[PDB]
């Protein structure tokens, strides 16, 4: 028996000055009927309304490391973190993240400087994000889509789709921050359409079968070369740079140091480098993360069983 | 008698989130010796401290908008903005302006998130600046090297580098705020590196001869279309966008609406847009800059007289 998706979310400003999910977001709050389908209306959320009105990714911590159920369930205070207080209210809205009261899904909205075209961030394998991708990949032939796992560290999830039951990040780059660009702003609203099309169909019992695909699973993070003091000493090499989920072979050039001389990847494997020189990622200590490039086979979600 | 230019200032980090002239700035305070030419040394200078530490375009006033003698003049507080007081503190540096004690020149580095490539803005059409950008031409052929005059409205003037008696900005894009490429950083270094060479040339006496050439000439800003209440009712149409001095005709699209609909450029003129959607120049209400394209003689500097 499946379970329909009815309390469903779309979150922009998350990050204030990733100027997409900022825009539609409130042209949605003004004209929310682009948001309804037959089954369903999803809800329009300004996730960071502060770091927005500001045009700044967060104003005192990053509102999308802010969802642990440890920050969530701390005990308030005045000097608490702007993003924490808010996302203690997102918690109110959502979730509660972890209770039956969550929402189905939220679908939160993103833009990077790196050049990673259309990319789905996905905290887990579950199957309903993997036919999602699929769904957008064959809706848009020629259009790469590609999905990235982020499976958290261990324990506790940070983000702000952590809160529903279930959710996903959409990711469109490149895109300097503050700049809203109309190619991007459209075929981001399309993508959201053809979502919301997608959860309709779930929702109506739409037989979904089994496939295989190529995703890119999360090894890891590498920083920039930097002195004894943190400071860079180096960027992204030209041969790297813009080429997101690109094959990189170790002996490849990953870095230009500023005394000219190059650094080479020292891997013992071919790896798939994504969010290559991503403005928010600097202060992470993040050049780029390491994925590796694995095909997955994904079970059918079908109305009912064989 | 041509005057040597002994006291040259190269100044980055004015805007804090322009990664070329941050680290080339803070790269030549530790490695001086690449601005030493024979007859003199150019002083570098990160010129907004504490917005280059912060990451940000200014703190409190965009400091390329608070060297006014009015601004320079005008009597200290505690309440004043900070980058009035770095103002004052560059006034003391590198003028003060108006007086005899001001340096030479002020080459002052900017990035844009726009596609200017590289592009000179000149505040006057002096026609030493006209030279060094037909000299710079004349050294990268194949590379386009733009000539921006941008005129103050009136009296006064407002930038970092009108401090000085001369001075120009060497602007590069389209690179994100808060992202450093490799390949800006190296030729925006590599034509620094020019613009010091030819000021040597002029130090030692060379001859430079008449010579016409076209320049942009500013004829001021369209804003983004907005709503009743100032928000962004659309962006930058995606057939103007990333097109930067190249001709705009009456009747060609300039923007999309949210709504789906076109707004097309009304002018009499054919106009050559640049800074097309630059981050910073949202809340400046500006969307781009009209330019005229107009054919300008230059001219000779030359060390005697005819
Ligand atoms: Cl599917
Ligand atoms: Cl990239
Ligand atoms: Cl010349
Ligand atoms: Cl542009
Ligand atoms: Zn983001
Ligand atoms: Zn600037």
Same mark, same amino acid.
């Given at each position: 028996?499946?379970?329909?998706?009815?309390?469903?979310?779309?979150?922009?400003?998350?990050?204030?000055?990733?100027?997409?999910?900022?825009?539609?977001?409130?042209?949605?709050? /003004?004209?929310? @009927?682009? #948001?309804?389908?037959?089954? +369903? *209306?999803? !809800?329009?959320? %300004?996730?960071?309304?502060?770091?927005?009105?500001?045009?700044?990714?967060?104003?005192?911590?990053?509102?999308?490391?802010?969802?642990?159920?440890?920050?969530?369930?701390?005990?308030?205070?005045?000097?608490?973190?702007?993003?924490?207080?808010?996302?203690?209210?997102?918690?109110?809205?959502?979730?509660?993240?972890?209770?039956?009261?969550?929402?189905?899904?939220?679908?939160?909205?993103?833009?990077?400087?790196?050049?990673?075209?259309?990319?789905?961030?996905?905290?887990?394998?579950?199957?309903?994000?993997?036919?999602?991708?699929?769904?957008?990949?064959?809706?848009?032939?020629?259009?790469?889509?590609?999905?990235?796992?982020?499976?958290?560290?261990?324990?506790?999830?940070?983000?702000?789709?952590?809160?529903?039951?279930?959710?996903?990040?959409?990711?469109?780059?490149? /895109?300097?921050? @503050?700049? #809203?660009?109309?190619?991007? +702003? *459209?075929? !981001?609203?399309? %993508?959201?359409?053809?979502?919301?099309?997608?959860?309709?169909?779930?929702?109506?019992?739409?037989?979904?079968?089994?496939?295989?695909?190529?995703?890119?699973?999360?090894?890891?993070?590498?920083?920039?070369?930097?002195?004894?003091?943190?400071?860079?000493?180096?960027?992204?090499?030209?041969?790297?740079?813009?080429?997101?989920?690109?094959?990189?072979?170790?002996?490849?050039?990953?870095?230009?140091?500023?005394?000219?001389?190059?650094?080479?990847?020292?891997?013992?494997?071919?790896?798939?480098?994504?969010?290559?020189?991503?403005?928010?990622?600097?202060?992470?200590?993040?050049?780029?993360?390491?994925?590796?490039?694995?095909?997955?086979?994904?079970?059918?979600?079908?109305?009912?069983?064989?």
């Amino acid at each position: 028996s499946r379970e329909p998706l009815l309390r469903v979310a779309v979150t922009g400003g998350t990050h204030g000055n990733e100027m997409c999910g900022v825009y539609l977001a409130r042209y949605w709050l /003004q004209n929310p @009927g682009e #948001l309804q389908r037959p089954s +369903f *209306s999803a !809800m329009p959320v %300004l996730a960071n309304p502060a770091a927005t009105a500001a045009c700044c990714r967060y104003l005192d911590r990053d509102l999308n490391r802010s969802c642990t159920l440890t920050f969530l369930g701390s005990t308030a205070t005045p000097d608490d973190p702007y993003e924490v207080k808010r996302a203690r209210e997102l918690n109110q809205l959502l979730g509660p993240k972890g209770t039956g009261q969550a929402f189905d899904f939220t679908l939160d909205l993103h833009n990077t400087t790196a050049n990673t075209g259309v990319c789905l961030i996905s905290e887990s394998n579950i199957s309903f994000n993997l036919h999602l991708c699929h769904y957008l990949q064959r809706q848009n032939p020629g259009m790469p889509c590609r999905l990235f796992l982020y499976e958290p560290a261990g324990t506790e999830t940070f983000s702000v789709e952590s809160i529903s039951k279930n959710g996903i990040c959409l990711a469109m780059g490149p /895109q300097p921050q @503050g700049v #809203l660009r109309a190619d991007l +702003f *459209s075929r !981001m609203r399309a %993508l959201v359409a053809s979502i919301l099309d997608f959860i309709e169909l779930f929702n109506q019992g739409m037989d979904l079968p089994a496939f295989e695909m190529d995703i890119y699973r999360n090894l890891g993070s590498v920083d920039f070369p930097r002195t004894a003091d943190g400071d860079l000493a180096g960027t992204v090499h030209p041969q790297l740079q813009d080429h997101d989920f690109e094959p990189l072979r170790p002996g490849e050039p990953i870095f230009k140091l500023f005394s000219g001389e190059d650094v080479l990847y020292e891997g013992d494997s071919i790896v798939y480098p994504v969010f290559i020189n991503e403005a928010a990622y600097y202060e992470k200590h993040v050049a780029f993360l390491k994925s590796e490039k694995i095909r997955v086979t994904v079970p059918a979600l079908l109305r009912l069983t064989p």
